[PDB]
Paper text:
We also prepared the H3mm18 NCP sample for the cryo-EM analysis in the presence of the PL2-6 single-chain antibody variable fragment (scFv), which stabilizes the cryo-EM nucleosome sample by binding to the acidic patch of the NCP. We determined the H3mm18 NCP structure at 3.4 Å resolution without crosslinking. The overall H3mm18 NCP structures are similar between the crosslinked and non-crosslinked samples. In both H3mm18 NCP structures, the entry/exit regions of the nucleosomal DNA are drastically disordered, and the central 125−130 bp region of the DNA is visibly wrapped around the histone octamer. Intriguingly, the EM density of the H3mm18 αN helix was ambiguous, suggesting that the αN helix region is unstable in the H3mm18 NCP. Since the H3 Arg53 residue is replaced by a Ser residue in H3mm18, the histone-DNA contact at the H3 position 53 may be abolished in the H3mm18 NCP. In H3mm18, the neutral Cys40, Leu72 and Cys83 residues replace these basic Arg residues, and may reduce the histone-DNA contacts at these sites. Similarly, the asymmetric DNA detachment is also obvious in the H3mm18 NCPs. Interestingly, the N-terminal regions of H3mm18 were flexibly disordered in the H3mm18 NCP. This suggests that the interaction between the H3mm18 N-terminal domain and the H2A C-terminal domain may be weakened in the H3mm18 NCP, and thus may enhance the DNA end flexibility.
Residue numbers in the entry:
A (entry chain C): 16 to 107
B (entry chain D), E (entry chain H): 33 to 124
C (entry chain E): 56 to 132
D (entry chain F): 25 to 101
F (entry chain G): 14 to 106
G (entry chain A): 61 to 132
H (entry chain B): 20 to 101
The structure:
DNA sequence: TATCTGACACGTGCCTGGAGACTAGGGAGTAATCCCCTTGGCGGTTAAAACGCGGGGGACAGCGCGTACGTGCGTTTAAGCGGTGCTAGAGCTGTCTACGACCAATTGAGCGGCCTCGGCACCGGG
DNA sequence: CCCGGTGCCGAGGCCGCTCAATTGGTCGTAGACAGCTCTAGCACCGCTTAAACGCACGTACGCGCTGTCCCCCGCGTTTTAACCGCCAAGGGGATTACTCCCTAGTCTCCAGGCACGTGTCAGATA
C-alpha cells in the first residue's frame, strides 16, 4: 500500500480518491494525499492522546465525548481550531 | 459499504494508548472531526491552487493550507509530520 | 460537571414538530434529527446564558435580567 | 407549545451556564430566542430536505443547516 | 485582457436610472459584489450537488442555493426572475 | 437570437457565467439552464442595489453614485444589510 | 481618520517580523487601513453599548474587554 | 532598515475621532493603550495571513488581493480592491 | 466674460471567446420491490413540574465628594505634496520535459454479520 | 465515605466476500525554467501648513455610602405527564433494472467586448 510506503496509519488511497472525486482541482499530485493523510493522522493522534490522558486523570479506561471535550477546551491552540464546534454528550 | 475512518483511528489509539478503549459515540465524534478537517484543508488548498491559476493540488498547497488553518505550534508540528511522511514516501 | 441533556425530550419534540408544520406541513422527522436539534439548542442556550452572566457581572449586578440577553445577542449578532 | 420549555429547565440551562441569580422576566426572553433559533435552523433543514425530494428530515439535514449557520455539530454524521 | 462586469452593470444602471452615472470606485465595488454573490451561489450549489451524489448542477441546485442564501422577499424575487429567464430561454 | 444573454432577455452574460461554472471546480457537469438562472439572479440583485443607490443619490441632489451612496443603500435596507453584514464598503463612510 | 504615513510605518514594522524581505503595494496599505478603520469603529460602537449598559457615559477598558470577549 | 515603536504613531486625536465616528462621547485616558494593543493584534493576524499568501505565490510584494484574501479568511470581506 | 482641466463617456480594431451544428456516451429519470424506521395509541410509576409562604439579599435611588475629562490657546512637529531617480521585480513569453490521467489485470484491505467478555452502573455492608 | 458480590450490553475480535487500490505502461499537456522589458515601490529633498502636543481650568460625573423595599431562592406539599415497555400499521427510503436525451467534445465561424485614443460636463483660473 501507500500508507506503509509513507509509514502512516491513515489511508493514502482513500485520501487520493477523495481529493480527486471532491472537485477540488482538475488534477491532483502524488504528494498531496500523503501530506494530507499525515496531517490528519497527527491531529487525530493529538486529540486521542489528550483525551486518554484526561480519562486517566478520571480513572476511566474508555475515551468518551466528555473526555474529548475536556481535551479540546483545555488546550488554547486546539480550542481555537474547534471554537465554533459543539459536541454531542460533551458537556461544559 | 460505507467509508469511515474508524479502523485508522483505532490503530492510532492503540498506538498512543495500547490499554485505553474508546466509546462508539467518541468514534463518531472523531470520524466527524477527521472529515471536517480533511474538507477544510482540501478546500483551502483548492482556493490556493485556483488563486494562482494552477490546476494541480501539490504538496505545497496542502502545506500552505495547513499553515493557514491551524494555530502556531499545531501548524508547526503538522508541517513537520507531513514533510516527514512525504519524504519517507518518495524516498522509496 | 455533567454532560447530559437538560430539556425534556417530548416537549422539545412537540415544539420542533409544531414549528416545522409552518414551513412544510407533511414532513416526518428522524429520531436523530430531533436529537441533533435538541443538542444544538441546549448548547446555544448555554452559551447565551454564559454571555448574559458576563454582562450582568459587568453591570455591577449578580442577577441576570433581559437587558443582558439583548446586549449579548447584539454583540454576538 | 413553547411553554413546554419550563422554568426549571431554563434554570438548569442557566446554572450550567454559571448564572447565580435569575430574574423573572428572563424565561420569556429565553423562550423567544429559542423559538427564533429553531425557526432558522428548521427552515434551512426543510429546504435541504425538499431539494432531495424526500419527505423525512434526517440528522444530516440538520447538521448541514447548522454548519450553514456556522454551528458545526459533531456526533451525528 | 482582464475581464469584469463593467459593461453589464452600466447597462443595468441605464435601465434603472436612464440619466445618472457611477463613479469608478463605486463601479469596482459593484463588480466585487457581483463576484462575491456569484461565488456564494456557486459554492452552495456545488455542495448541494455533492450531498445528493449528483454530478451536474441543474437549475434546481442554483434555485435552492438562492433560496438558502437570500432573505425572504429578496429570495422570492430572485427566484421569480430566474424562473422567468429560464422559461424564456427554453421556450425559444 | 445568436447571443444567449438576449435569448433569455438579460443584461448579464450567460456564456461567461457558463464558462465560469465550467472552470470553477464546482462540478464535472453543468446544465444548460443553470447559467441562465444564475445570471438572472445576479442581474436582479444588481438592479435592486443600483436602484436603491440611485434613489439615495437623488435624495442628496447628486448625479453620480459614489461608494457612500452604496453604503447608505445597503445599510438602510434590512434584507440587503443582512446579506452583506460582514462586508466593508471601501470609502463608504 | 488615521494618518497614512504612521499607519504604513506600523504595517511595515509588523511585517518585518514575518519576512525580512517584503515590500507592499500602495493598494495593500489602503486595504489594510480601511479594514483597520472599520474594525476599530465597530469595536467602539460595541464599547459604547457596553458602557451605556453599565449606566456610565465614559468608556473604560473593561468595556472594550467585554466587547472583545463577547464578540469572540 | 528596521523600524521601532510606530504603534505610538496612532495619536490620541485619531483614536478619539474613531470613537466619535463610533458614537462615543466621553473617553477614559486608559482607552488609548487598549485600542493600540487591539489594533496591533488585529493587524498582526491579517499581515501574517497576507504574508503566507504572498510567500506561497513565490513573490516578494504583498498585493491588495493578498490582503483581501487574508481578510476574507478572517470573515471580514472587503469590497473595492478587485 | 475666455480657458483649461480632470474623471465620465463615446468611436474604431480586432482576436479571442462565444455561438451553430452534430455525434456518442452515460447521468439521470422512472417503474417496481423490500423492509426499516416512523407514527400513534395505551398503561404504570414516579420524578419532575407547579403552587404557595417567608425572609433577607440584592436592586435601585439619592447624595456627596474629588477626580479626571473636555475645551481653549499658543507652540511644535511632521504629514502631504511636487519632483527626481533608480532598480528590484512582476508579468509575458518560448521550450521541453517530467508528472498526472486512463486503462487493463490482479489482488488484498476493508466492510458486514456474528460472537464472547470485560468496563462500568448498583448496592448494601464495611 | 470505601468493597466485594452480582450483572449486563456494547466493545473488540473473527471470517468470508468484494470492489477499490496497486502494478506496469503510454499519452498528453501543465508547469518549471531561462530570458526580457516595462512598471511601480522605495529612498531622498525643499516647502507649507495642518494636525498634534503641552498646561490651565472649570466642572460632569464615576465611585462609594447609606437607606428602602421587593421579589427570588429555600423549602414543603400537591399534581401531572415524561418515560419505559408493548403492539399494530404503513409509508417512504434504499436499491435494482431499463431507457433516453442532455451534455462533454470537436470543428468552423464570426461578433462583441476589451483596449487605446479623443470628446465632453462640473468647476476654478487667470
Amino acid at each position: 500500500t501507500r500508507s506503509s510506503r509513507a509509514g502512516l496509519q491513515f489511508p493514502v488511497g482513500r485520501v487520493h480518491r477523495l481529493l480527486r472525486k471532491g472537485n477540488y482541482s482538475e488534477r491532483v499530485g502524488a504528494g498531496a494525499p500523503v501530506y494530507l493523510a499525515a496531517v490528519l493522522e497527527y491531529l487525530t493522534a493529538e486529540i486521542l492522546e489528550l483525551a486518554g490522558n484526561a480519562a486517566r486523570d478520571n480513572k476511566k479506561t474508555r475515551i468518551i465525548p466528555r473526555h474529548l471535550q475536556l481535551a479540546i477546551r483545555n488546550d488554547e491552540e486546539l480550542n481555537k481550531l474547534l471554537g465554533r464546534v459543539t459536541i454531542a454528550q460533551g458537556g461544559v | 459499504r460505507k467509508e469511515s475512518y474508524s479502523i485508522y483511528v483505532y490503530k492510532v489509539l492503540k498506538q498512543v494508548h495500547p490499554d485505553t478503549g474508546i466509546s462508539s459515540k467518541a468514534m463518531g465524534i472523531m470520524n466527524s472531526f477527521v472529515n471536517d478537517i480533511f474538507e477544510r484543508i482540501a478546500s483551502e488548498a483548492s482556493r490556493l491552487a485556483h488563486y494562482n491559476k494552477r490546476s494541480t493540488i501539490t504538496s505545497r498547497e496542502v502545506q500552505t493550507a495547513v499553515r493557514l488553518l491551524l494555530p502556531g505550534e499545531l501548524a508547526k508540528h503538522a508541517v513537520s509530520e507531513g514533510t516527514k511522511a512525504v519524504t519517507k514516501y518518495t524516498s522509496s | 460537571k455533567s454532560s447530559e441533556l437538560l430539556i425534556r425530550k417530548l416537549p422539545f419534540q412537540r415544539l420542533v414538530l409544531e414549528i416545522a408544520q409552518d414551513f412544510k406541513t407533511d414532513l416526518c422527522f428522524q429520531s436523530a434529527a430531533i436529537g441533533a436539534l435538541q443538542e444544538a439548542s441546549e448548547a446555544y442556550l448555554v452559551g447565551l446564558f454564559e454571555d448574559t452572566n458576563l454582562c450582568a457581572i459587568h453591570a455591577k449586578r449578580v442577577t441576570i435580567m433581559p437587558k443582558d440577553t439583548q446586549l449579548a445577542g447584539y454583540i454576538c449578532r | 407549545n413553547i411553554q413546554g420549555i419550563t422554568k426549571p429547565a431554563i434554570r438548569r440551562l442557566a446554572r450550567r451556564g454559571g448564572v447565580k441569580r435569575i430574574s423573572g422576566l428572563i424565561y420569556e426572553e429565553t423562550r423567544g430566542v429559542l423559538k427564533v433559533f429553531l425557526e432558522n435552523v428548521i427552515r434551512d433543514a426543510v429546504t435541504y430536505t425538499e431539494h432531495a425530494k424526500r419527505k423525512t428530515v434526517t440528522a444530516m439535514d440538520v447538521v448541514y443547516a447548522l454548519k450553514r449557520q456556522g454551528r458545526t455539530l459533531y456526533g451525528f454524521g
